[PDB]
Amino acid sequence: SDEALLELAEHIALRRENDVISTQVAFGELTVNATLSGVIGLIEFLRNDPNCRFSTLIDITAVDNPARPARFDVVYHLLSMYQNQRIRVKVQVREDELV
Amino acid sequence: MLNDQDRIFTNLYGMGDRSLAGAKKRGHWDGTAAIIQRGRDKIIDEMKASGLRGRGGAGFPTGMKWSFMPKESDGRPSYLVINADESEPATCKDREIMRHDPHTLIEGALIASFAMGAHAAYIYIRGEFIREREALQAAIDECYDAGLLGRNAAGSGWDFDLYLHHGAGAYICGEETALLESLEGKKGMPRMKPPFPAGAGLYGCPTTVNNVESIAVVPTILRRGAEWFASFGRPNNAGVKLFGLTGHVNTPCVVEEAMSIPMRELIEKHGGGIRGGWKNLKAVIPGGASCPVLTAEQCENAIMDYDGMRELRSSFGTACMIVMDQSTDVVKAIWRLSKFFKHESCGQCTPCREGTGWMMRVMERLVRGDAEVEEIDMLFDVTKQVEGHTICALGDAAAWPIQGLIRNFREEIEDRIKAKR
Amino acid sequence: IPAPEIQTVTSWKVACDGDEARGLGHPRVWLAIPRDTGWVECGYCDKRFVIDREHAHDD
Amino acid sequence: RYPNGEERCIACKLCEAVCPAQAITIDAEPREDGSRRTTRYDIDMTKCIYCGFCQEACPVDAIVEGPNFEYATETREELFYDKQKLLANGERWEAEIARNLQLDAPYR
Amino acid sequence: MLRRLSPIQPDSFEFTPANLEWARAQMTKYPEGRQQSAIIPVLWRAQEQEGWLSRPAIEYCADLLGMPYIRALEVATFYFMFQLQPVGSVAHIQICGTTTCMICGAEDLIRVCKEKIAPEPHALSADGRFSWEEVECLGACTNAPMAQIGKDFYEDLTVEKLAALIDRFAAGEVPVPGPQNGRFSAEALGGPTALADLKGGEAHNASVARALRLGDSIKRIDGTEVPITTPWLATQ
Amino acid sequence: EWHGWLHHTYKEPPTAAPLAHKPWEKPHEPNLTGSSGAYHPAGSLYRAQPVERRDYDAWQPE
Amino acid sequence: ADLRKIKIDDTIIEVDPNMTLIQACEMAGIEVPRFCYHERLSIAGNCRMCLVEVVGGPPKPAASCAMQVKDLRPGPEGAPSEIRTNSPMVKKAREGVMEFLLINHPLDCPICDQGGECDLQDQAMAYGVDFSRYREPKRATEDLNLGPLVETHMTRCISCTRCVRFTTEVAGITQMGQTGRGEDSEITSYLNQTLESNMQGNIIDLCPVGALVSKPYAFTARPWELTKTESIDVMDALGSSIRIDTKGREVMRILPRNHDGVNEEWISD
Amino acid sequence: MRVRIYKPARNAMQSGTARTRNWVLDFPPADPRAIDPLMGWTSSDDTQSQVRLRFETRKQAEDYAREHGLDYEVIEPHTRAANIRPRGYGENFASDRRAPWTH
Ligand SMILES: Cc1cc2nc3c(=O)[nH]c(=O)nc-3n(C[C@H](O)[C@H](O)[C@H](O)COP(=O)(O)O)c2cc1C
Ligand code: SF4
Ligand code: SF4
Ligand code: SF4
Ligand code: SF4
Ligand code: SF4
Ligand code: FES
Ligand code: FES
Ligand SMILES: [Ca+2]
Ligand code: NA
Ligand SMILES: [Zn+2]
């Protein structure tokens, strides 16, 4: 599943180059850092794309990082029951910025 | 074999005349001025060629050690300290040199001191050797009267003073840096290196520490010659060596022999053989307490020299042996050494202050068989935690005897556990 | 305050654990009786150990 | 208390540190005889979650959760237990508490 | 074993005039400002004079050499030849217990000591005249089993011979030290196996010969027994 | 004495297997909540002598 | 000013050659366990907890507190000398020394004032094994009479001699020493007299274990309860940098904090 | 209110330096605490003192206080400079030492 998640991350980085800032696979989980302006387009691609069929939204939450210029992270957790895989999407948000 | 003509210590037993005149009859103090006028470099270069190696326990090339000393004085005086502590449990060779053939030690001190550019030498003798110190002090006073020591020592044109200093019962004070601490009026705790003694030793001045037998041999090598000394023994194991035969031999004694003599020939020739015949031999500790024990079979072809004992996974040490026959409890023998090392650790550094006691108390239970068999491997592991992790080599010396027992007599330890359980 | 318990011992080193079976006391500690005063007290249970000087056996 | 009648608590404060609800408050001084003992030992029973972490953390089995569960009160402040109240509970329930400790000792 | 000073201490210490003279000579063997080097020899002489090392002696010798008291106390407790409490008034028997003497019967010798002197080491006999202790190797292992009494080694011992020796000390005699089995010094029993021709040159070995001449084996040294000489002061 | 048996914690009744008691133990009391013997904190207004609290000593004029 | 390059683990760093390896490691932000070494005391080298591996040297681990950078043999061709603080040898050395430190240490943490801010607890957690192999009786030690400021529990002493080195070098008194030999060697004051120094309270900080503790502070708090305020002392005109530890409304103790230009890291009694 | 921006100093009781890397923005207690009469607990109406923020650099702490209109004081830290011993361990045995080293 580690090789599988790295392969899947390349597929996303390739098809959504401008949405994706970077990807990471740590502790067996794939995290995608995305731009705020492209997060909706990317999550839509993840939902509908054949290789990555992330049609279950597990949840959305935020993390506060006061030491950072963009203090908030908004985190999207998505599950695919058909592909049997998970993904996390993270976007950095400034205070008073709209998501 | 060695014959009287080739024996350096010719009055080792003190049977002959012990006066200064009697020593001169035996060739000592003979042309000391001429040797010194050969210069520092020629003497050092000759000691290097003779192949002499430290007789204190580690066997480091002596001439090389002398060449670490500075050639010019930078304001700090140089010192030679002669190590007469001799508290290693099986070692008694140095006792004879100091009380019966002192003039070999005194002259070697002068020549060695000149070779390092030292005007003063200090002999550190163990405090238990009360009569040896009185006898050695009497010889030093004879030499001062004869002019062999003092303003123009032996007519050589070198101002040399020889002092006698004694300890008060610490085996760790034989360690070279602990000796300097004891000589300065402190409790004898070793120093870490660096600084090295050639850089900062006694009083923070350049110092060389040599064993009594290392120095006492110097004048004869220079008089007879480096090639003669290197004739005896195997290559890289040169010279004649004072041996101690102790334990369960017919006639225990101290004797001078060539290096690399077979162990059996040494025992049979001078020890009178094993008590009850060679087949009664059980184990031998070949070079003092800190040397791993040897089985009866390993001693068959053992060659008494630095390479021979290393090849058998043991150490040459001081070359004084403990011979144990088939009636000896070997686990009890090694245990009593663990008790010795626990008694002697200076307590400065953790792995030996705490480790030696732990090793002793596990060994005591192994003597009685009051242990699990898994504690033998545990004990071996504990010794490895001490060895190499301490300030001074006493930590190592406390681990090797136990490691030798486990490597060579493990079945005897496992029998005691089965015998009791 | 008087001690809750006194034991007389013939050794200068004692161990106390609250005298309770199989892990029901306090952590086991070793205490040294000074030769000057001849008694020591457990820091956990306050038990006092008192040396029997005439029979006190050095180890 | 110990079988010798002395308090088991030595004011280590491990129970106060582990308490998830911060229900324990302790103050200690050296006693007149020099012993390490508490002068205040409060449990706020309206903060406590009855998790038993304190008895797990105690190194001397001083604080325990006992078998009693029928102590409903008519006023809230009757549930602010001070040191003497807790010690009185231990002196009345010791026989059952000690037996329970023996029964569960093989699993602790 | 904890190294502590005895709880009962003499009120004062003072070197005898000849021992104070001897001590000052010892300080001249070491460079200027290094007189603290003489602490061990000077402390040893204090014990020799009195038979044990007392607190006033340690403080007296610290003042003589300009050391702090704690520094001098460290020396006294680190070096185990110093007796920090009274020992037997007549003699103190030190029996080697290390391996070579152990496998040659040292433990049987210790059994003799417990029967004749005292059940435990460092304990005075009922008279107050004898004490014993077990010590590590004394560097006479070819003469094992052996013991030290006073200044002298008594070597090649046996339970019978050691018992007899203690009886002579108890009667006020000083038996001859050295090998008790007829050996000379350290050569093989039954004649040297090397340097055999020299036999006859000297009656006794160096240790025994000096002991017989001076008779100070168990004598409190007052400093008037050996002349005080400093030949090194001429060298400059 | 009987609580453990009545709640099935112990198999045998205290008649057959009596509980060991230490000499410093105290007799059982029921719940005293609605009575005058109810426990109250030292600073309670029920106490009628509530313990006064402070953490510093004040200087007193001469 | 001829800085020398050295490679520590995987960090190449340039340091004064007179630095010891332990000082260089801290400059590189690499943690090295220690008990006996202190920045402002003479190097002792007795705890053996700071042992590191010098790549290419003899198999013996080296005490990083005592080895100057210039003592390291230069690397081949002039490459920077390498030392490892992460190798299996170092891991085994640290585990071995920690085991030796604990075999005779008393099971005192609940009643010991050091608990919660103890270097022995913390480095045992980080650098030791989680179990014991020691099955023998432990050493028990008598306590000292050092006066009304320092309470002693000498069974806890790990023989680091920080107290001796501070009182002798910094406080300038000669009352403390280490008598005896071996595992029976005791840290002590001469004649069991109370220490005479208005700088003696500093040994409470310096002692890494609860052997030397504060009598006035004894048993009153645990380190995790305290609110810490960095302030300035007014008991004299030096203006020492201090830390005030409060619990609720009350100050519970006063500790020094470092100021190289005023009080270093000491305060008076 | 007024906040403190400072780098917490090493605990003198310990030699570790891991709790000395971060900057903190603190809201120091604003009014006196009181003693609860009933149980003697420490009472407070100052919940703002519960807040303790953590930063990696002084700039980050100073920025946050500025973006949030907080009056702040920055206390500068006192780093301990390395005590470089020219002779290292060897100074313990220097010939010119005032007194012998005690080990
Ligand atoms: C614990 C210990 C004890 C030692 N005892 C002695 C000794 O008694 N006599 C001796 O000559 N060397 C002894 N040594 C060896 C010295 O440290 C040093 O290596 C030697 O004296 C140098 O002299 P050499 O090279 O001429 O042999 C001892 C070493 C250690 C670690
Ligand atoms: S290894 Fe033993 S004798 Fe050597 S310094 Fe360490 S504690 Fe002292
Ligand atoms: S049982 Fe109650 S007092 Fe004990 S730790 Fe849990 S919440 Fe705290
Ligand atoms: S009850 Fe136990 S854990 Fe709590 S302070 Fe007392 S001894 Fe420590
Ligand atoms: S010094 Fe540290 S490890 Fe030792 S008992 Fe105290 S808190 Fe525990
Ligand atoms: S008392 Fe403390 S500072 Fe002194 S040597 Fe022992 S552990 Fe080190
Ligand atoms: S073993 Fe006894 S004198 Fe050497
Ligand atoms: S810190 Fe280096 S040996 Fe102690
Ligand atoms: Ca009490
Ligand atoms: Na401390
Ligand atoms: Zn107890």
Numbering used by the authors:
A (entry chain C): 6 to 104
B (entry chain F): 1 to 421
C (entry chain R): 3 to 61
D (entry chain I): 56 to 163
E (entry chain E): 1 to 236
F (entry chain q): 63 to 124
G (entry chain G): 2 to 270
H (entry chain Q): 1 to 103
Give the text the authors published on this PDB structure.
Respiratory complex I is pivotal for cellular energy conversion, harnessing energy from NADH:ubiquinone oxidoreduction to drive protons across energy-transducing membranes for ATP synthesis. Complex I transfers two electrons from NADH to ubiquinone, feeding electrons to the electron transport chain for O2 reduction, and captures the free energy released to transfer four protons across an energy-transducing membrane, generating the proton motive force that powers ATP synthesis. All species of complex I contain 14 conserved core subunits (or their equivalent) organised into two seven-subunit domains: a hydrophilic domain that catalyses the redox reaction, and a membrane domain for proton pumping. The core subunits of human complex I share higher sequence similarity to complex I from P. denitrificans (Pd-CI) than to other bacterial models such as Escherichia coli or Thermus thermophilus.
Here, we present the 2.3-Å resolution structure of complex I from the α-proteobacterium Paracoccus denitrificans, a close relative of the mitochondrial progenitor, in phospholipid-bilayer nanodiscs. Three eukaryotic-type supernumerary subunits (NDUFS4, NDUFS6 and NDUFA12) plus a novel L-isoaspartyl-O-methyltransferase are bound to the core complex. During processing, relatively poor map quality was observed for the distal membrane subdomain, and classes that lacked density for it were again identified suggesting the subdomain was lost prior to reconstitution. Both datasets yielded maps for intact Pd-CI-ND with global resolutions of 2.4–2.5 Å, and as no substantial differences could be identified between them, they were combined into a final 2.3-Å resolution reconstruction. We conclude CI-PIMT has diverged from the PIMT family, losing its catalytic ability, and assume the canonical Free-PIMT performs the PIMT role in P. denitrificans cells. Pd-CI is insensitive to NEM12 and displays all the structural hallmarks of the closed state. Specifically, the ND3 TMH1-2, ND1 TMH5-6 and NDUFS2 β1-β2 loops at the domain interface and ubiquinone-binding channel are well ordered in their closed-state conformations, ND3-Cys47 is buried, NDUFS7-Arg77 points away from NDUFS2 adjacent to a loop element, ND1-TMH4 is bent, and ND6-TMH3 is fully α-helical. We propose Pd-CI is stabilised in the closed state by the PIMT, which binds on top of the ND3-TMH1-2 and NDUFS2 N-terminal loops. In addition, a bound Ca2+, coordinated by the NDUFS2-Asn8, Asp49 and Glu54 carboxylates, Arg6 carbonyl, and one resolved water (a second is assumed), stabilises the NDUFS2 N-terminus and bridges it to the β2-β3 strands. Density in the central polar region of the channel has been assigned to a partially inserted ubiquinone-10 molecule with its headgroup within 4 Å of ND1-Arg38, Trp41, Met244, Lys295 and NDUFS7-Arg77. As both the enzyme and ubiquinone are oxidised, the observed binding pose is not a reactive intermediate, and the substrate is required to move further into the channel for reduction.
